[PDB]
């Protein structure tokens, strides 16, 4: 039942911008999300001080996916442990405690990819978090699907648009509610030629070119959030990427880089059936 939103797909209602994604299958400069628009959106909340740590996504009733650099990044003296964080699911407003809607869960264990490269280019920027107890689904809490080889092959194409969501900065400016922006995947050569950072097959970039007029990008605090696409085949939402890195936010000639979820699914599966 993953990837089918209670307030949209389940009722045969479409959100205001999913058509844009579909037409292409042939947060800075974003907008307020609709209620229940991204039921898999997870907020990584730091206990002390109480603040936004990163975004994340719900992939099952007990597992949450995020970016490794959200939990471990020595250059900025970041090395969070289970008890340092909380997971807030079903939220819309950034700072308000949404009584009777959101669910706050504690972490049981954190799993960071063994070959995550924080020293150089954030290669394999991915991590799993197992919750102490199952989260109850609702109109505002629902898991997104993980792509299989076929889904990745057909949707991960230059030009095809995905959707990024988060409570991160609005400019390189804190949002009142969850923000959303649809961005086109960019050809590998263009991604490579836009930066001096070494790009790997475990990442893909997205965003508009300067000549395309439109813009948008993820920013500080959006890391760990999902880059999703709605399959035109079975109408389910799939998380194809994880907000990973970028040089600044929404700069012309630059693009956002996302962890290639399918490429690391082997690891995800391994961890889930081994420890969970």
């Amino acid at each position: 039942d993953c990837g089918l939103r209670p307030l949209f797909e389940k009722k045969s209602l479409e959100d205001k911008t999913e058509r844009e994604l579909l037409e292409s299958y042939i947060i800075v400069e974003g907008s307020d999300a609709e209620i229940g628009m991204s039921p898999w959106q997870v907020m990584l909340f730091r206990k002390s001080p109480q603040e936004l740590l990163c975004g994340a996504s719900l992939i099952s009733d007990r597992w949450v996916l995020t970016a490794a650099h959200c939990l471990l990044y020595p250059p900025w003296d970041k090395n969070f442990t289970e008890n340092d964080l909380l997971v807030r699911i079903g939220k819309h407003s950034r700072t308000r405690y949404e009584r009777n809607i959101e669910k706050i869960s504690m972490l049981e264990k954190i799993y960071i990819h063994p070959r995550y490269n924080w020293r150089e280019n954030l290669d394999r920027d991915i991590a799993l978090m197992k919750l102490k107890k199952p989260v109850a689904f609702s109109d505002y809490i629902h898991p997104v699907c993980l792509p299989d080889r076929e889904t990745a092959a057909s949707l991960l194409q230059a030009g095809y648009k995905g959707r990024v969501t988060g409570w991160g900065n609005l400019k390189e400016g804190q949002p009142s509610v969850l923000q959303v922006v649809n961005l086109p995947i960019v050809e590998r050569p263009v991604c490579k030629d836009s930066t001096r950072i070494r790009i790997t097959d475990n990442m893909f970039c997205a965003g508009y070119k300067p000549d395309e007029g439109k813009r948008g990008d993820a920013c500080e605090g959006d890391s760990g959030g999902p880059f999703v696409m709605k399959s035109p085949f079975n109408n389910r939402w799939y998380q194809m990427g994880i907000v990973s890195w970028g040089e600044g936010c929404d700069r012309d000639g630059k693009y956002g880089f996302y962890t290639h979820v399918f490429r690391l699914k082997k690891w995800i599966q391994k961890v889930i059936d081994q420890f969970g």
Binding site: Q50, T95, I104
Partner: peptide, 11 residues
């Protein structure tokens, strides 16, 4: 500027 969350989760 974050609203105080229940103590049950902080404990």
């Amino acid at each position: 500027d974050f609203e105080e969350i229940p103590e049950e989760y902080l404990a």
